[PDB]
Design an enzyme around this catalytic site. Structure first.
Site, PDB file in Angstrom:
ATOM      1  N   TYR A  45     -15.166  72.266  14.624  1.00 33.70           N
ATOM      2  CA  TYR A  45     -13.959  72.782  15.724  1.00 33.70           C
ATOM      3  C   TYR A  45     -13.601  74.243  15.682  1.00 33.70           C
ATOM      4  O   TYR A  45     -13.879  74.959  14.804  1.00 33.70           O
ATOM      5  CB  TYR A  45     -13.086  71.977  14.807  1.00 33.70           C
ATOM      6  CG  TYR A  45     -12.370  72.486  13.261  1.00 33.70           C
ATOM      7  CD1 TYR A  45     -11.849  73.629  13.319  1.00 33.70           C
ATOM      8  CD2 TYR A  45     -12.957  72.192  11.987  1.00 33.70           C
ATOM      9  CE1 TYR A  45     -11.121  74.243  12.196  1.00 33.70           C
ATOM     10  CE2 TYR A  45     -13.169  72.731  11.119  1.00 33.70           C
ATOM     11  CZ  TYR A  45     -11.465  73.675  10.769  1.00 33.70           C
ATOM     12  OH  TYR A  45     -11.356  74.562   9.778  1.00 33.70           O
ATOM     13  N   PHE A  55      -6.356  81.821  11.696  1.00 32.22           N
ATOM     14  CA  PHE A  55      -7.519  81.474  12.912  1.00 32.22           C
ATOM     15  C   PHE A  55      -8.181  80.871  11.775  1.00 32.22           C
ATOM     16  O   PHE A  55      -8.740  81.150  10.710  1.00 32.22           O
ATOM     17  CB  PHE A  55      -7.816  82.435  13.569  1.00 32.22           C
ATOM     18  CG  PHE A  55      -9.356  81.814  14.531  1.00 32.22           C
ATOM     19  CD1 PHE A  55     -10.203  81.108  14.714  1.00 32.22           C
ATOM     20  CD2 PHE A  55      -8.283  82.336  16.242  1.00 32.22           C
ATOM     21  CE1 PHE A  55     -11.290  80.573  16.025  1.00 32.22           C
ATOM     22  CE2 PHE A  55      -8.616  81.296  17.402  1.00 32.22           C
ATOM     23  CZ  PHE A  55      -9.839  81.240  17.065  1.00 32.22           C
ATOM     24  N   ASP A  56      -9.249  79.529  12.371  1.00 31.25           N
ATOM     25  CA  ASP A  56     -10.404  79.001  11.454  1.00 31.25           C
ATOM     26  C   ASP A  56     -11.853  78.623  12.653  1.00 31.25           C
ATOM     27  O   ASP A  56     -11.221  77.571  12.821  1.00 31.25           O
ATOM     28  CB  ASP A  56      -9.408  77.989  10.572  1.00 31.25           C
ATOM     29  CG  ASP A  56     -10.203  76.233   9.684  1.00 31.25           C
ATOM     30  OD1 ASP A  56     -11.180  77.974   8.364  1.00 31.25           O
ATOM     31  OD2 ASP A  56     -10.206  75.956   9.820  1.00 31.25           O
ATOM     32  N   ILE A  75      -4.821  66.058   9.182  1.00 30.10           N
ATOM     33  CA  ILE A  75      -3.768  65.285   9.732  1.00 30.10           C
ATOM     34  C   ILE A  75      -3.282  64.282  10.727  1.00 30.10           C
ATOM     35  O   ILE A  75      -4.547  64.179  11.501  1.00 30.10           O
ATOM     36  CB  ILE A  75      -3.478  66.691  10.622  1.00 30.10           C
ATOM     37  CG1 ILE A  75      -4.216  67.891  11.449  1.00 30.10           C
ATOM     38  CG2 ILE A  75      -2.714  67.714  10.140  1.00 30.10           C
ATOM     39  CD1 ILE A  75      -3.755  68.455  11.861  1.00 30.10           C
ATOM     40  N   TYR A 101       1.660  69.680   9.931  1.00 27.09           N
ATOM     41  CA  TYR A 101       1.842  69.514   8.896  1.00 27.09           C
ATOM     42  C   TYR A 101       3.559  69.902   8.236  1.00 27.09           C
ATOM     43  O   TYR A 101       4.163  70.253   7.337  1.00 27.09           O
ATOM     44  CB  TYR A 101       1.666  70.632   8.196  1.00 27.09           C
ATOM     45  CG  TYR A 101       0.377  71.312   8.010  1.00 27.09           C
ATOM     46  CD1 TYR A 101      -0.486  70.394   7.121  1.00 27.09           C
ATOM     47  CD2 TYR A 101      -0.515  71.229   8.951  1.00 27.09           C
ATOM     48  CE1 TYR A 101      -1.810  70.879   6.642  1.00 27.09           C
ATOM     49  CE2 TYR A 101      -1.887  71.707   8.904  1.00 27.09           C
ATOM     50  CZ  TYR A 101      -2.663  71.619   7.706  1.00 27.09           C
ATOM     51  OH  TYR A 101      -4.514  71.055   7.993  1.00 27.09           O
ATOM     52  N   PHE A 118      -6.131  73.493  19.096  1.00 30.08           N
ATOM     53  CA  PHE A 118      -7.971  73.299  18.271  1.00 30.08           C
ATOM     54  C   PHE A 118      -8.893  73.134  19.644  1.00 30.08           C
ATOM     55  O   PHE A 118      -8.297  72.328  20.347  1.00 30.08           O
ATOM     56  CB  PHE A 118      -8.194  71.931  17.209  1.00 30.08           C
ATOM     57  CG  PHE A 118      -7.719  72.005  15.846  1.00 30.08           C
ATOM     58  CD1 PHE A 118      -7.851  72.352  15.214  1.00 30.08           C
ATOM     59  CD2 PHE A 118      -5.938  70.856  15.698  1.00 30.08           C
ATOM     60  CE1 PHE A 118      -7.551  72.080  13.442  1.00 30.08           C
ATOM     61  CE2 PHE A 118      -5.155  71.877  14.273  1.00 30.08           C
ATOM     62  CZ  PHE A 118      -5.647  71.912  13.425  1.00 30.08           C
TER      63      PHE A 118
HETATM   64  C1  LIG Z   1      -3.915  73.382   4.772  1.00 28.43           C
HETATM   65  O1  LIG Z   1      -5.203  74.053   4.902  1.00 28.43           O
HETATM   66  C2  LIG Z   1      -5.941  73.733   5.811  1.00 28.43           C
HETATM   67  C3  LIG Z   1      -5.816  73.784   6.693  1.00 28.43           C
HETATM   68  C4  LIG Z   1      -7.308  73.757   7.598  1.00 28.43           C
HETATM   69  C5  LIG Z   1      -8.557  74.756   7.262  1.00 28.43           C
HETATM   70  C6  LIG Z   1      -8.462  75.174   6.135  1.00 28.43           C
HETATM   71  C7  LIG Z   1      -7.104  74.540   5.278  1.00 28.43           C
HETATM   72  O2  LIG Z   1      -6.922  75.646   3.371  1.00 28.43           O
HETATM   73  C8  LIG Z   1      -7.591  74.022   3.351  1.00 28.43           C
HETATM   74  O3  LIG Z   1      -9.803  75.376   5.752  1.00 28.43           O
HETATM   75  C9  LIG Z   1     -10.709  75.039   6.092  1.00 28.43           C
HETATM   76  C10 LIG Z   1     -11.597  74.909   4.925  1.00 28.43           C
HETATM   77  C11 LIG Z   1     -11.486  72.921   4.889  1.00 28.43           C
HETATM   78  O4  LIG Z   1     -10.785  72.881   4.670  1.00 28.43           O
HETATM   79  C12 LIG Z   1     -10.479  71.519   4.117  1.00 28.43           C
HETATM   80  C13 LIG Z   1      -9.853  70.959   5.222  1.00 28.43           C
HETATM   81  C14 LIG Z   1      -8.356  69.668   5.618  1.00 28.43           C
HETATM   82  C15 LIG Z   1      -6.992  70.469   5.292  1.00 28.43           C
HETATM   83  C16 LIG Z   1      -6.547  69.745   6.615  1.00 28.43           C
HETATM   84  O5  LIG Z   1      -7.129  70.136   7.844  1.00 28.43           O
HETATM   85  C17 LIG Z   1      -5.994  69.550   9.045  1.00 28.43           C
HETATM   86  O6  LIG Z   1      -6.356  68.111   8.784  1.00 28.43           O
HETATM   87  C18 LIG Z   1      -7.288  70.071   9.918  1.00 28.43           C
HETATM   88  C19 LIG Z   1      -7.968  69.593  10.491  1.00 28.43           C
HETATM   89  C20 LIG Z   1      -9.524  69.802  10.057  1.00 28.43           C
HETATM   90  C21 LIG Z   1      -9.884  71.187   9.779  1.00 28.43           C
HETATM   91  C22 LIG Z   1      -8.626  71.621   9.727  1.00 28.43           C
HETATM   92  N1  LIG Z   1      -7.423  71.601   9.500  1.00 28.43           N
HETATM   93  C23 LIG Z   1      -6.618  72.504   9.951  1.00 28.43           C
HETATM   94  O7  LIG Z   1      -5.114  72.451  10.211  1.00 28.43           O
HETATM   95  C24 LIG Z   1      -6.923  74.218   9.558  1.00 28.43           C
HETATM   96  C25 LIG Z   1      -5.957  75.148  10.222  1.00 28.43           C
HETATM   97  C26 LIG Z   1      -6.158  76.427   9.789  1.00 28.43           C
HETATM   98  C27 LIG Z   1      -5.058  77.578   9.845  1.00 28.43           C
HETATM   99  C28 LIG Z   1      -5.381  77.860  11.244  1.00 28.43           C
HETATM  100  C29 LIG Z   1      -5.285  76.379  12.094  1.00 28.43           C
HETATM  101  C30 LIG Z   1      -5.728  75.111  11.493  1.00 28.43           C
END
Ligand SMILES: COc1cc2cc(c1OC)OCCCOCCCCCOC(=O)[C@@H]1CCCCN1C(=O)[C@H]2C1CCCCC1
Length: 128
Positions: A45, A55-56, A75, A101, A118
């Site tokens: 992703y 960005f991630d 999420i 969130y 995403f």
């Molecule tokens: C709120 O925290 C984060 C959010 C997101 C990335 C993050 C993160 O740090 C904990 O670091 C990436 C390292 C993976 O760590 C486990 C991810 C689970 C967290 C839940 O993630 C999600 O639900 C979604 C979907 C799966 C990939 C991660 N995603 C995110 O929302 C991303 C964000 C980061 C900032 C830019 C938008 C996406």
């Protein structure tokens, strides 16, 4: 602008039809099997606030991202959107805070009432 393209052109895949998760398919996957709740799923992703401000990527970590579908390890938007995908599909999601969130946000990464974008590729999914 990939987030705007998804606003204009996305399919609303929410139950309640609230445009909270919008989807375009950008590359087509295989078969007709899509993952069921409790399936283990493998993805790459690229993600960001639609502000373009944080960005991630799975690639940052140099490895695939793995979770159990519909167990709330992610999420709500992911559990909903990925479920609509086929092995090998790439799709774009635009997501309102209610499916990400929320008003509480997730600081420092995510602010209150954030919209997320995403690009997701589904690689594999094995049964529970
Ligand atoms: C709120 O925290 C984060 C959010 C997101 C990335 C993050 C993160 O740090 C904990 O670091 C990436 C390292 C993976 O760590 C486990 C991810 C689970 C967290 C839940 O993630 C999600 O639900 C979604 C979907 C799966 C990939 C991660 N995603 C995110 O929302 C991303 C964000 C980061 C900032 C830019 C938008 C996406």
């Amino acid at each position: 602008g990939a987030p705007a393209t998804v606003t204009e052109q996305g399919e609303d895949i929410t139950s309640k039809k609230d445009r909270g998760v919008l989807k375009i398919v950008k590359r087509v996957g295989n078969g007709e099997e899509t993952p069921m709740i409790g399936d283990k799923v493998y993805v790459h992703y690229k993600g960001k606030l639609s502000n373009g401000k944080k960005f991630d990527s799975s690639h940052d970590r140099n490895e695939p991202f793995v979770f159990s579908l519909g167990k709330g390890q992610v999420i709500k938007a992911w559990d909903i959107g990925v479920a609509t995908m086929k092995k090998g599909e790439i799709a774009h999601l635009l997501i309102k805070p209610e499916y990400a969130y929320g008003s509480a946000g997730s600081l420092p990464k995510i602010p209150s009432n954030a919209t997320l974008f995403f690009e997701i590729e589904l690689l594999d999914f094995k049964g529970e």
